[PDB]
Amino acid sequence: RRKRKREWDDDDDPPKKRRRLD
Amino acid sequence: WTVDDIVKGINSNNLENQLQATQAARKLLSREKQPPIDHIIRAGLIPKFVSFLGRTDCSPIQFESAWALTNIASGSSEQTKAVVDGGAIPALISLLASPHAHISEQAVWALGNIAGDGSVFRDLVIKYGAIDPLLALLAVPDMSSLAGGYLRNLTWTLSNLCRNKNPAPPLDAVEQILPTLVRLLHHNDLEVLADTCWAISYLTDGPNERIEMVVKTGVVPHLVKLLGSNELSIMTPALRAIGNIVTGTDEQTQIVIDAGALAVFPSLLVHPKTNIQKEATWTMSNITAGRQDQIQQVVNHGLVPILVSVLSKADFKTQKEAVWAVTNYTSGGTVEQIVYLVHCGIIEPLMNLLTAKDTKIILVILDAISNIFQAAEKLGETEKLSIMIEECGGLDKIEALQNHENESVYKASLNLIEKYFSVEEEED
């Protein structure tokens, strides 16, 4: 029939930003 | 310290006061939950940090400014934009070459945050020439634990440079990055492997041209090896990448199948994590949408009864993906493959899903039923299939669909009923 491409979601997509703490 | 004290120290002619003020600002940003990022930006300190980045005569102020900029750019898009508009990107790229490793790595982290904000800043970081210094940092022999942590930091930044779409990363940059990702995939560090698989999955999420770029490097076999990992942090991104690759052409899907991915999918199709289950079933549906040899490989790996189990007893999202898998199977499969599917017991679960409230799913299920009936016609067992469907309660559901609001459903179910369930026998 057709290949179905991925749909937009964030199931576990990694973090986009990280803060450095101390 | 207050922002007022920090501002007073930073505009002082004494470098030590400037350093102490930068330390105080960095401590506000690194030690306080809910830091005063917006007050710091409104104080006009971003130009001052960007200026300190170039003070090679005082490496501590460089480190403190890079840390402060990292934590500022780690917030909202407007805060990262304040960092970008202050001229931070070229200064951080230049700081990448600092002889002190901790300063260069803080610059790496800052650039990673900036690029992770979105495609615009990602293309900006790429445009100002970050890739070559980053890869120079990633060509150093990393044999220590500190080297391992720095490798994690660098891989995370690189993956953020591979991330986001509309627009997608420039092709020249992706080809400049790919060899390093292939090399990194052969490390033993779980975080490095996870971040690298995530980068691969970003690069594979798009038109078949990007999938071809990733596939030509030859990583798919090692991606499958990582797919067989007992680490969810590594399997998840690897499964996303494999799924993206099998959404492409028949030859790319065949690259995946020859790498042995199907041999891992039993475990994936019954995985406790429902997200993993749904992802694997979606991947299977894109594989059953392939050539007949690929469907035959799905059969050889014993995956059809597993898919029947999923269609029967899984959550509704995974059941929807299973519906797509079944319909693609029956659309592209041979008569013998469809007969095998029937013998594994697809009819009852497939039909029980006709009570779902998703009209598109009901139409897909009816299309699968029509494909199965056409295979039966080719065999001459249409009557036996009618009796099977009636005895599992399927005729009831098709008849009920003849009262559905949606006219597509009504016409489809009526077509099936008129073609196979409205028989008249007049025997002598």
> CATH number, domain at B303?
1.25.10.10
CA distance B136 to B403: 67
Cis, peptide link before residue B170, omega less than 30° from 0: no
At B417, list the tokens: 């009923």
Contact flag B332-A12 (C-beta cutoff 8 Å): no
Show residues of chain A in contact with B282, CB under 8 Å: 4
Q: Best interface-test mutation with B: which of A2, A6, A12, A17 has the largest number of B CBs within 10 A? A: A17
Specify if B427 maps to a domain. Answer: no
At B167, list the tokens: 């627009």
Contact flag B159-A12 (C-beta cutoff 8 Å): no
Specify if B201 maps to a domain. Answer: yes
Specify if B387 maps to a domain. Answer: yes
Residues of A with CB under 8 A from a CB of B: 1-6, 11-22
Show residues of chain B in contact with A5, CB under 8 Å: 247
Domains of chain B: total: 1
Contact flag B116-A1 (C-beta cutoff 8 Å): no
Q: Is B23 an 8 Å CB contact of chain A?
A: no
The phi and psi torsions of B291 (rounded to 5 degrees) equal -65, 170
Overall residue count recorded for chain A in this entry: 22
Residues in B 290-309 with any Cβ partner in A closer than 8 A: none
CA distances from B211 to B113, B216, B269 (A): 26, 9, 24
Chain B, nearest residue to A7 by Cα = B205
CA distance B143 to B362: 57
Q: Is B105 an 8 Å CB contact of chain A?
A: no
Tell which phi-psi region holds residue B333, choosing left (phi > 0), alpha (psi between -120 and 50) or beta: beta
Show residues of chain B in contact with A8, CB under 8 Å: none
CA distance B310 to B385: 22
**DSSP conformation class of B263:** G
Chain A, nearest residue to B73 by Cα = A17
Show residues of chain B in contact with A18, CB under 8 Å: 74, 109, 112-113, 156
CB atoms within 10 A of CB A10: 7
Specify if B167 maps to a domain. Answer: yes
- Which of B116, B240, B324 lies at the smallest CB-CB distance from A17? B116
Specify if B426 maps to a domain. Answer: no
Return the beta strands (E) in B208-329 as ranges: none
Cite the DSSP H helix spans in B74-130: 77-85, 88-95, 101-116, 119-127
Show residues of chain B in contact with A12, CB under 8 Å: 236, 275
CA distances from B373 to B247, B334, B378, B428 (A): 28, 13, 9, 29
Q: How was it solved? A: X-ray
CB atoms within 10 A of CB B383: 11
Specify if B74 maps to a domain. Answer: yes
- What is the extent of the structural domain holding B195? 3-421
Counting other chains too, the contacts that B36-45 makes at CB distance below 8 Å and 24 or more residues apart are: B36/B3, B37/B71, B37/B72, B37/B75, B37/B79, B38/B79, B39/B3, B40/B3, B40/B6, B40/B68, B40/B72, B41/B72, B41/B79, B41/B82, B43/B3, B43/B6, B43/B7, B44/B7, B45/B6, B45/B7, B45/B10
At B91, list the tokens: 């200064």
- Which of A5, A19, A21 lies at the smallest CB-CB distance from B247? A5
CA distances from B349 to B73, B280, B389 (A): 51, 19, 11
Specify if B246 maps to a domain. Answer: yes
Residue type, B426: E
